[PDB]
Design a protein around this ligand. Structure first.
Ligand SMILES: NC(=O)c1ccc[n+]([C@@H]2O[C@H](COP(=O)([O-])OP(=O)(O)OC[C@H]3O[C@@H](n4cnc5c(N)ncnc54)[C@H](OP(=O)(O)O)[C@@H]3O)[C@@H](O)[C@H]2O)c1
Ligand SMILES: NC(=O)c1ccc[n+]([C@@H]2O[C@H](COP(=O)([O-])OP(=O)(O)OC[C@H]3O[C@@H](n4cnc5c(N)ncnc54)[C@H](OP(=O)(O)O)[C@@H]3O)[C@@H](O)[C@H]2O)c1
Ligand SMILES: NC(=O)c1ccc[n+]([C@@H]2O[C@H](COP(=O)([O-])OP(=O)(O)OC[C@H]3O[C@@H](n4cnc5c(N)ncnc54)[C@H](OP(=O)(O)O)[C@@H]3O)[C@@H](O)[C@H]2O)c1
Ligand SMILES: NC(=O)c1ccc[n+]([C@@H]2O[C@H](COP(=O)([O-])OP(=O)(O)OC[C@H]3O[C@@H](n4cnc5c(N)ncnc54)[C@H](OP(=O)(O)O)[C@@H]3O)[C@@H](O)[C@H]2O)c1
Lengths: 260, 260, 260, 260
């Protein structure tokens, strides 16, 4: 697991929705590679636990602030807290995304529809507008979006969610084209089924409910992902190892086929 | 131009935003192939002119109703008027889409962002929910979305618009997966630069402002599209000639390359 | 539904490997729309039966010539026969393709590999170079490739075959970019599982081996294709209904998802 | 930035066609991260210079063997030399690829066509079959293909070449699906214009012929690539940082848009 990579010394990153699951793994990895990192999530207790968890592993260049990521007030607070703690911003990882609905797409209300886009898409656009001048002032940097494999393969039950993630593919690209002039590279990841609280209902009926899911999902590599499976990609995308890559999505799904 | 195709005898279609440009061409073609068609747009005068234009060519199974497509009141009025005039609904063509902004994506306000999605995406989802039970009652039918080539290649100046069109790719797919159980096929078109009022600012500086655009756009076929270039595809997608095709987007851009 | 479409009066098409299945349906449809058509396949008896079958339906503007499609001698004979019979060539449908192997990709010999590419790709390139000057002389026309959905979703057992079909996506595009100057549009179809002799081993355990296959395959529309499901698309792509479309693949797979 | 990454201690890689350009940068990076590496190319003098160059930087876990990559004798010699020198094989990087033709696709002879596929595709398939049992014996590993952005965007002048690279996308995927059972991940890179001897004719009219090329090409990041721009990606794809990623292509083109 320790790569000895230290591609982030003297960089500051914000990772949204990063007190559990994929986001926390991303933050941990950036911290292992020498970054200072601000994490956030809604619940102060989750922030507290995540900060304690990281500091217990010796990763002390971390701070946390509780906030709703789709609140414009909390967005500004997150960005200002980052600047207060660490003086600058190099990287933004828009990891947040919700999935409240489960059902047929025709049963998604106009309100639930709007909420899905508000949190899953709009909030990342807003965060991007706020961090932009700060990242540009450092001569450039990176923004990463956590979309989903379901951007590409429309899933049953969470199809409206999936559509938001398709949107993030386009937003990743549009921001990439637009922020290239500031040497800000914008890329994304499109994870498959990762074992987290969000996907729990699909995989928490034993070893064999997990194997049956691996089967149905058609996962070449024959297992479900874990949060750490995303982190090496995020680190790669936010580092100089990808300095000539912008506007791309990397599918992290164990070999599930949804585009060429 | 006359194909002698009559694949739409005894079918009823709604074509939104169909008093000018691509939408009117789509309506004309469906009418040539024997459909009854309802068109709509905001301005009653545009509705009146379009109906007169079609009736002068002998295409009399047409009716029109003025309405804002993103108004829930007007959506219901459009669908109810269709049922009042023609008794059923087989096909919906969600042709509407706006593009008010021109500038950098970072300059798009939260409000303009939401408006873009409201009209370009949400309204088609809403129209789809309203027509759904009526189409299903006929044993199936078709829904077509007019997205854009800029779903795939993020353009300068209208990038937020482009993102909405990416979203429509995902929405087309999600609706396709979800409405297959009702034998409702959902597909889209992704046009390149079509000469209409919407794209006018790009191509209305003579023959050579058009040739310079053809160059920059990298259009293999060396010309800009016209509304009629979309109509044969829509007809194809809404007919039995595509009865085994659902969830697809067809790029109609004269050979511009943006996916495999 | 016989469509009444008559988009091909005065046009001549060559449809390769067109004495059974998809190719014969393509030829029949072009003939219904008023084309003159040359078909070919290896076996003179199959040629004879196909010609008899078409002439019994009153489609008499057809001729046939037996030949191996990957033989350079037979390619030249096919094109020269077409010019002798009908004087010109407007359309080429490269329908041919084989799949001798079934097994793991690692068990495909170098020889079988080369044969797959020779017939599935190279022969279409060769036919394209032979018809090219003749189609250009008519002011343009169309060339269609029959690839496969398995170009996009790598299948088990016939993966090497699948790779040849991926190649055809690229070849379709490359020829489109290259022949646009001659107003020759080059597009393709990428069918899913179509019930023919070729795909028989996948679907031939009764009507619920077919329903089990449509769940494994995740076919939204809940059924397997038939040859006629491809024909409407080919006709569309070869007609003026698609006059602004070049370089594109249309997946004809009942809603199987493999790209955006 | 030398990354301090050391993800390849105790691993052995073969990098084909790796005495200049992208391949040599790939080899150098794997060596910096602690791998043992075998390189090869046709010309013994190039092998000698590359080995001297690497050993002068202190990267001594390298060996070289001259050979033609599309020779079955030389393929076997390369794999056997690697096993003789280092005892095992964990990683294969199929970097090789040629482009002899420059002109229209219609001017590509059958012979040149076959040669393009022989070297650009078949040789990678062959190398994959030879290394396969050895990599499987280590419990898995990785195979990387160097395709090209021109797999996705068909270029003028080298279109046949481009088609071979499209094929590699398919081959990457097919091998990924097929070798997943052995925990061998197969991924690729699709570079844009990288400044090497191979691409020299496109970019070698001074520093503003380079800037003119970056506008024609629509390279968001406003510059041409260098070999080192590929290496970080290869290292990432061959390391545990991508342990849940198989079947994917990463475009490394400074933000040129060619798929979603
Ligand atoms: N798990 C998967 O299978 C999967 C697959 C593809 C993509 N993704 C994407 O991965 C991302 C993270 O998901 P995950 O699976 O890691 O979920 P998770 O483990 O349940 O983590 C959710 C995190 O987001 C925070 N959060 C929830 N709502 C929030 C809000 N409104 N404002 C700020 N923070 C909020 C949570 O903390 P609080 O409760 O303290 O707010 C927690 O830190 C999402 O974008 C999701 O769509 C997940
Ligand atoms: N032209 C292009 O280059 C191009 C390229 C790709 C995609 N498209 C898409 O094609 C679609 C139609 O565009 P077009 O180029 O044909 O535009 P156009 O010729 O300017 O036509 C616009 C039509 O939409 C109506 N409309 C505008 N706002 C409306 C609203 N809020 N509610 C209902 N109707 C409304 C207009 O009538 P009123 O003024 O009476 O409302 C008119 O009938 C859009 O989805 C657009 O994004 C266009
Ligand atoms: N069936 C499917 O599920 C499916 C799915 C996707 C794509 N496709 C594609 O559809 C195309 C047609 O296949 P199909 O399923 O229609 O097969 P089919 O019904 O078995 O017919 C194959 C046709 O090709 C002819 N043929 C075979 N080898 C030939 C050769 N070497 N030279 C000239 N003609 C030859 C056969 O006639 P002779 O025996 O007389 O030569 C016959 O007319 C192929 O490109 C295939 O890859 C099929
Ligand atoms: N440069 C670009 O813009 C670009 C863009 C996209 C993809 N690529 C891909 O990058 C890969 C490497 O190309 P490059 O640009 O790095 O080229 P390069 O700097 O010119 O180097 C080519 C290398 O291949 C070796 N080689 C050539 N033919 C060979 C053969 N038949 N057998 C074994 N080795 C051989 C050469 O050595 P000898 O002369 O000693 O054989 C040399 O080490 C290719 O797959 C190419 O298609 C390049």
């Amino acid at each position: 697991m320790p790569s000895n990579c230290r591609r982030f010394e003297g960089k500051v990153a914000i990772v949204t929705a990063a007190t559990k699951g994929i986001g926390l793994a991303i933050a941990e990895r950036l911290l292992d590679e020498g970054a200072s990192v601000v994490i956030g999530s809604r619940n102060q207790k989750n922030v507290d636990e995540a900060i304690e968890y990281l500091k217990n592993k010796g990763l002390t260049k971390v701070a946390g602030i509780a906030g709703h990521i789709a609140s414009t007030d909390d967005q500004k607070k997150l960005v200002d807290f980052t600047l207060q703690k660490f003086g600058k911003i190099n990287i933004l990882v828009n990891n947040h995304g919700i999935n409240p609905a489960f059902g047929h797409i025709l049963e998604v209300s106009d309100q639930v529809w709007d909420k899905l886009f508000e949190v899953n898409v709009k909030a990342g656009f807003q965060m991007t507008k706020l961090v932009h001048p700060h990242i540009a002032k450092e001569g450039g940097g990176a923004i990463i979006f956590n979309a989903s494999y379901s951007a590409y393969k429309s899933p049953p039950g969470i199809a409206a969610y999936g559509v938001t993630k398709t949107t993030l593919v386009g937003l990743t690209r549009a921001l990439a084209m637009g922020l290239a002039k500031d040497n800000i590279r914008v890329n994304g990841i499109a994870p498959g089924v990762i074992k987290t609280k969000m996907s729990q209902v699909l995989w928490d009926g034993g070893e064999d409910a997990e194997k049956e899911l691996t089967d149905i999902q058609e996962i070449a590599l024959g297992r479900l992902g874990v949060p750490d499976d995303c982190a090496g990609t995020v680190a790669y995308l936010a580092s100089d190892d990808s300095s000539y890559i912008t506007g791309e999505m990397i599918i992290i799904a164990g070999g599930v086929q949804a585009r060429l």
